[PDB]
Amino acid sequence: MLLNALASLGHKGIKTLRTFGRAGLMLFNALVGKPEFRKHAPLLVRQLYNVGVLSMLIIVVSGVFIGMVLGLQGYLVLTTYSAETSLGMLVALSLLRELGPVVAALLFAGRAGSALTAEIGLMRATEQLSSMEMMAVDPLRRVISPRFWAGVISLPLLTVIFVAVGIWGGSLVGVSWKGIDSGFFWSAMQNAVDWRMDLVNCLIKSVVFAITVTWISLFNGYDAIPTSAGISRATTRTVVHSSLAVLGLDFVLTALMFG
Amino acid sequence: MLLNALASLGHKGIKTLRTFGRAGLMLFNALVGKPEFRKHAPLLVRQLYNVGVLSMLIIVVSGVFIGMVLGLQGYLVLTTYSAETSLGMLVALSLLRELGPVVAALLFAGRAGSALTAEIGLMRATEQLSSMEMMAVDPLRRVISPRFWAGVISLPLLTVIFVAVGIWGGSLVGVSWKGIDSGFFWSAMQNAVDWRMDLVNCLIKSVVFAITVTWISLFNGYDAIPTSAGISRATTRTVVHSSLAVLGLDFVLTALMFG
Amino acid sequence: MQTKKNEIWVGIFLLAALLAALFVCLKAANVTSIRTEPTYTLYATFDNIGGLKARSPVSIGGVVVGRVADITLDPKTYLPRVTLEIEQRYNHIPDTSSLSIRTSGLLGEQYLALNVGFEDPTAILKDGDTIQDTKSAMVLEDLIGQFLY
Amino acid sequence: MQTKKNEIWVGIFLLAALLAALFVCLKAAEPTYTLYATFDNIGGLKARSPVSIGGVVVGRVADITLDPKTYLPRVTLEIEQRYNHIPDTSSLSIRTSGLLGEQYLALNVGFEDAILKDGDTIQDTKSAMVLEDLIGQFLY
Amino acid sequence: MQTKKNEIWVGIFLLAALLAALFVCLKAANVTSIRTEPYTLYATFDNIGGLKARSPVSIGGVVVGRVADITLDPKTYLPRVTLEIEQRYNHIPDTSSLSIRTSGLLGEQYLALNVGFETAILKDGDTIQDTKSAMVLEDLIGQFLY
Amino acid sequence: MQTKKNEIWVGIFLLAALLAALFVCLKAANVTSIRTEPTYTLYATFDNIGGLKARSPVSIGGVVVGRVADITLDPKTYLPRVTLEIEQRYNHIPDTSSLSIRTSGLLGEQYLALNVTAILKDGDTIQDTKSAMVLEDLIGQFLY
C-alpha cells in the first residue's frame, strides 16, 4: 503493498497536469497578441492548400461511398412497410444529426490532422522553430497562429461538402434500379428541416469538432522529442486522441438540442 | 496538344503499375516458403501485444460512446410509432451490419495500422533490415510474416469487443432514463434467429477489412525513403489509403450480401 | 512559395462549399425567405385534441396557410385552448365556420382543417374572435364499442 | 514556461473549465399528489405513462402495484396540485394515442351536483379493449 | 522528500475519482443482485401460434413471470409450456381459464392469466387443465365467408 | 524480453474476446450447438405458396422443428413443391394430417402450420390440402 503502490500512479498525475497545462498556455500566446492582419494574409492562403484543398479529395470520394451504403441498407429495413417515400428522413436526417461532423472529423485527423503534427515535428528536429527565436520574432505567432485559424474555418466548410455529396450519393443509390420517381424522394426530406433545428445545429457542433482536433495536432507537434522516433510517436498519438475527443464529445452534444 | 500533355502522364502511369507490383510481390514471398510453427511461436505473441492488446484503450472506451448515441438519437425519431419496443432494434441491427467492421476499422488503422507503418519504416532508416539481410536469415519472414498474421486474426477478435461494447453501451439508456428493463427492450433483439445473417456476414466483412488494412500498413513501411521525412510521409498516406479501402469496399461487400 | 497556384485552388474550395450550401438549402430544405412577416393570434377552444402536438400546420381548404405556436389549458373552464396563426393576405371568415381537426393518411400527424361557411345578405373576424362550432377529435376507443352496440 | 511552478495552475484551471462543460451541460440539460385506482385488466401498459384531462399531458405514473389478497392491478398516478375539484363519479376510460401508438391514461370531465385529496381511491373503472374476446363475439 | 510529498497527497485524490463513479456502472438492471429466482408450472395447449422462448406472462396487465422452454408431447403432438411465478403470489384458484392473447399487430403474443373467485391451490408439480388455444388469422376468414 | 508482464496481457485479451462472443452469439443470437441435424426430407405439393421464401420455418402446433432447404418447380404439372425437413426426435405423424400456410399476425412472414397410415418415410407424398389466401380472394368472394 500500500505504500509503494502509489509510486507508479501518483507520478503519472503530475505529468498529466503538466501536459494539459502546456496546451492551454501555448494556445493563449498563439491567439492573444499583436493583431497581425496584413502580415498573416499570405500565410493563411498558404496553409489552406495542405489543409483545405489537399484534404478535399478524400472527403469527396467518400461522400458518394457514405450514401450508397446508407441508402442501400436503409431500403431493406423499410421493406414490407409501405414507407418507400420516407427515404429522405433516413439518408438525409442521419447524415446531419448522427453522421456529418463525426465521420468527416475522423478523416480530417488522418489526412489533415496527422500531417499537421508531422510538419512541426520535422521542423523541430531540424530546429527551425528555434531559429525563429534568433530572428527577434515570436515563434508561436508565425508558425502556429496561421495553422490554427486555417483549420478552424476548413472543417465546418468541409462538413457541408460531406453532407451535400452524401445527400446526392443517397439519391444516386436511390433512383438507380428501384423504380421510384424523383418526386417522392424529395418530399419527406423537406419535413422537420428548418432554422436552428438541423442545419444550424450541424454547423454548431462542427466548429466545436474543429477546435478540439486542431488543438491536439498543434500541441503534439510542438511537444515532441527531436529525433527519428519522436516524430513518428507523436504522429500516431494525435489519431488516438482525436478519436476519443470526437466520439467522446458525441454524448455531450446529443444531450443539448436533441435532433 | 497531343505529345506535351501526355508526357507527364507517362511518369505517373508506369510508377502506379510499379506501386502495386512491389506490394503483391512482398506478400507473395512471405507464406509460400518453408512452414515453421515453433520458430515464430514466441514471435507471434510479441507482435500480438502491440497489435490487439495496446489497441484496447481506443476501441473499448469509445465503443460505449457509439452505442450511447444510437440510443439517444434513436429515441426521439420514433416517438410516434414505437418509443420502447423498437429502441433495441436499430441498435443491434446497425452495429452488426455496417457499423461493426467499418467504424472499428478506422480505429484499428489509426493506432495499430498507422504505427505498423512507422515501425517497419524506422528499421530502414537506421539500417536494421539491411543488417538482417546480410545474414542467412530471410528478412521477409522475421518482420513481415509474424506481423501480417498478427493483424489478420486481430481485427475479428477486436470487432466482437466493439460489438459487445455497443450492445451493452446501448443498454444504459434502455434499462434506465425512462425505459423498461427486459420486457420491451430485449424481446425485440432476437428477431434475427438465422445464423447466416448478422453472424457469418459480420465475420466475413471483418476478415476482408483486416487483410486490406494490414497490406497497406506493411507496404508503406517497407517502401519508404530512409530519412526523417519519409517515415512521416508514409504514416500519413497509410491512414488515407486504408480509409478508402474500408469505405470503397463497403459498397462492394454490401451489394452482393444485401441485395 | 507560389501565389499564382495556391490562390486559384482556394477559390475552387470556396465555391465547392458555397455550391454545397445551396444543395442542402434548396433541394434538401424548403426554405427560401428569411423574412419576419408577423401574423395575428386566433383563439379557439375544443374538448379533445387527440394527438395534436406543437408546431402543427393549419390549413383552410387543403393548403397550409400557417402553423400553431403553442397550446394552453384554461384553469377555470378546464377546456383546451388552441392558438392559430393565419396570414393577413385574405381571410373572409364568417361566424358560421366549423373547425375540425383531421389527420393525413393512417399513420400521419394531426392537422387543423378550417371549413368556410355561407353569409346572409354574420360579421368579420378580428384579432381574438372565438366561436363554439368546433368539432372534437375521435379515437379508436369510442368507434369500436359503438359499432357492436 | 517554468516547470513544476506555473504548468500546474494552468492544468488545474483547464480541468476546472473542461469539467464545467460536462457538468451543467450533460447532467440536467415538484409538489404532486398521488391517486389510486384498482383495475381488472389493462393490457400492455408500462410505467411513466402520460395522464391527460382533455388531451393535454399534465402528469405521469410513478409505478404500478399489485395487492397480494385480490390480485387486481392498481395504478398509482401522479397529477399536479394546481388542478383540483374532480368528481368521484367519473371513470378513467383508458384509450390509445393515435391508432398504432402506445397506451396512455386519460380522464374525462363529468357533471357536478367533493374534492379528491391525496390518498383517494377510484371506485368506478373501465376495462380496456382487448382483441382476444372482442372479435370472437361478432362471429360466435 | 520533495517529490514524495506530492506523491501521496494527489495520489489519494486520483483514487478518490476511482472510488467514485463505480456505483453508477454497477447499476441494478434485474432482480439478480440478491436472488435471481426463488415455482415451475405446466400448461398444455393445442396451438400456441407465434409463441417463442422467454415470453412474459401477465395477470391483468402487470408482468409476473417468464417462459423457460416449450417441449412437445411425443404421444398426442400437443405443446407443453412452463411458467416461472415468484413466491409473492401463490393463492391462485384452479378455475382460471388460461387463454393465449395477442400483443399488438406485429406477430408476437403473450400468455395472460385471469383471477377470480373459487378448491385446491396451484403449486409446483401440478398441471392446469383449464387451458385455451390461441387464434390464427386464417381461421376466422373461412368461418365468416362460409 | 523481461518475460514478466508481456505474456500475461495477451492471455487477458484472448480471454476477453471469448466472453464477448458468448454475450452476442450464445445470449441473443441462437443456441449454437454442434448442429448435426439428423433430419429427413419429405415432399408436399401445394397450389399457391404465396410468399414462401428460403429457410422458411415449419411448425406443428406453433413449435418449429425445422426449416425449408430448397423449393423446386416441376415442368410437367407446373405445381409448387416444398421440401420440408422433420427431425428424428419427433416421428409420429399420421397420413390424414393437413397443412396450412398461415401468417404470424398481419405483417410477419408466411409459415406452414401442420395440424393433427402409421407414419411417413423418405419417399412419401402428403395429400393435397388448401393453399394460402390472397387479397384478390377475400375481395372477390365478399362481393360476388
Added chain:
Amino acid sequence: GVVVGRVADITLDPKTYLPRVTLEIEQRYNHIPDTSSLSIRTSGLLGEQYLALNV
C-alpha cells in the same frame, strides 16, 4: 398507372377559396378529351397523395 407529369405549385382564390392545382405534361401525350376527370388517390400509409387521370 404510368407517371406523365408533376404538380408545379398550389394556388388559392381570394374570393371563393378554391385550390387550383396546376400540372404540366410533356408533348408526347396531347390527345386528351374534355370528359377526362381528375382523381386524388392515396399512395402509401404516410399521408401523401397523388393525382390520377381518368380518361
